[PDB]
Design a protein around this ligand. Structure first.
Ligand SMILES: C[C@]1(c2nc3cccc(C(N)=O)c3[nH]2)CCCN1
Length: 350
């Protein structure tokens, strides 16, 4: 009954904060991604250096697009590796020549960007954990495991776990309601087709996401890193987003975010187009159409947002040209179409 006297941060919030603010975990995560933390300590990384990294990736993009492989491309990849040091040990540093390889470097810089944010943020009479939490300017309130909200979100979590993501299952360890300063008032409440949708991210990135909100891509990032342009990406299948947690048997605790997304009218597309944003022409979002999705007969709503409970079934969508997405994804291009609402602490069972 100590809390009636002294009013502490709930233990579950303390443990969350300890988890996402762990700078050692960030160092290990970047070393796994082949970033050379010894040559370029994360503490000294600046926004300008990351920006310069993106500009080198753009030079690489120019080269890939022109089919170049000689001097221009070598010069570009060397420049990139000079600006964003990597550790390939004794192995030839690899060329960056495909969309997937470009995207991986982009995700490395996205992580570096959120790390730069976190290290600044975690720098009195106040306990370090109270200080970190305050500095997020984002309320996080644990929810009761016997609440209605917990039940619906566990159902959404399990029932939208996709059949082709069978290398793990997920256990919901804890649940927090998220109220980020400003989002309620900015949100596009007027738009129809408001859905509660998934976003996953690496564990290094949550200090940045909670303190700044979900953001569109850096303006200097190569556009070809982004399947449907520089928007904020969401899934209706929990495991499509959870894959982007990059959890593993070694590090099997990750987080998953649910947000209210004001989709309005969707421009529906069957295959990648990085210039998708320019195709909106008055519509409000992009939907990449998948072969399998939850169907409306099973939907429920939670506080005005449609919750697309599974199981997934065939959508009857095939592309007669080539590749079709396995599952849907949704893209909005203004943060005011996003209101963060829940954060799940997830145990991944490999
Ligand atoms: C490749 C990329 C990405 N695509 C997604 C599609 C559905 C969900 C997510 C998510 N993170 O939950 C996605 N993330 C592009 C933007 C950042 N990473």
């Amino acid at each position: 009954t100590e809390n009636l006297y002294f009013q502490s941060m709930d233990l579950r919030v303390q443990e969350l904060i300890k988890l996402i603010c762990n700078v050692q975990a960030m160092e290990e995560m970047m070393m796994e991604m082949k970033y050379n933390t010894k040559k370029a300590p994360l503490g000294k990384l600046t926004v300008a250096q990351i920006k310069a990294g993106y500009q080198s990736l753009k030079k690489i993009e120019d080269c890939i697009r022109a089919g170049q492989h000689g001097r221009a491309l070598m010069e570009a990849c060397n420049e990139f590796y000079t600006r964003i040091p990597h550790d390939f040990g004794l192995r030839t540093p690899p060329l960056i020549r495909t969309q997937k390889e470009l995207s991986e470097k982009i995700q490395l810089l996205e992580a570096l960007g959120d790390i730069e944010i976190a290290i600044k943020l975690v720098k009195s009479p106040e306990h370090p954990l109270d200080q970190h939490y305050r500095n997020l300017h984002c309320a996080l309130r644990p929810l009761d495991h016997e609440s209605y909200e917990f039940k619906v979100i566990s159902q959404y979590l399990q029932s939208t776990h996709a059949p082709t993501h069978s290398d793990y299952t997920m256990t919901l360890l804890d649940l927090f309601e998220v109220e980020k300063d400003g989002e309620k008032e900015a949100f596009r409440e007027d738009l129809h087709n408001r859905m509660l949708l998934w976003h996953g991210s690496r564990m290094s990135n949550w200090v940045g996401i909670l303190s700044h909100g979900l953001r569109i891509a850096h303006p200097e990032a190569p556009i070809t890193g982004y399947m449907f342009g520089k928007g904020i990406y969401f899934a209706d299948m929990s495991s499509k987003s959870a894959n982007y947690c990059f959890a593993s048997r070694l590090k099997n605790t990750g987080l998953l975010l649910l947000s209210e997304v004001a989709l309005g009218q969707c421009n529906e597309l069957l295959e990648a187009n990085p210039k998708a944003e320019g195709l909106l022409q008055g519509k409000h979002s992009t939907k990449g159409l998948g072969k399998m999705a939850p169907s409306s007969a099973h939907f429920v709503t939670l506080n005005g947002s449609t919750v697309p409970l599974g199981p997934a079934s065939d959508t009857g969508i095939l592309n007669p040209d080539g590749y079709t997405l396995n599952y849907n994804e949704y893209i909005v291009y203004n943060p005011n179409q996003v209101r963060m609402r829940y954060l799940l602490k997830v145990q991944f069972n490999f």
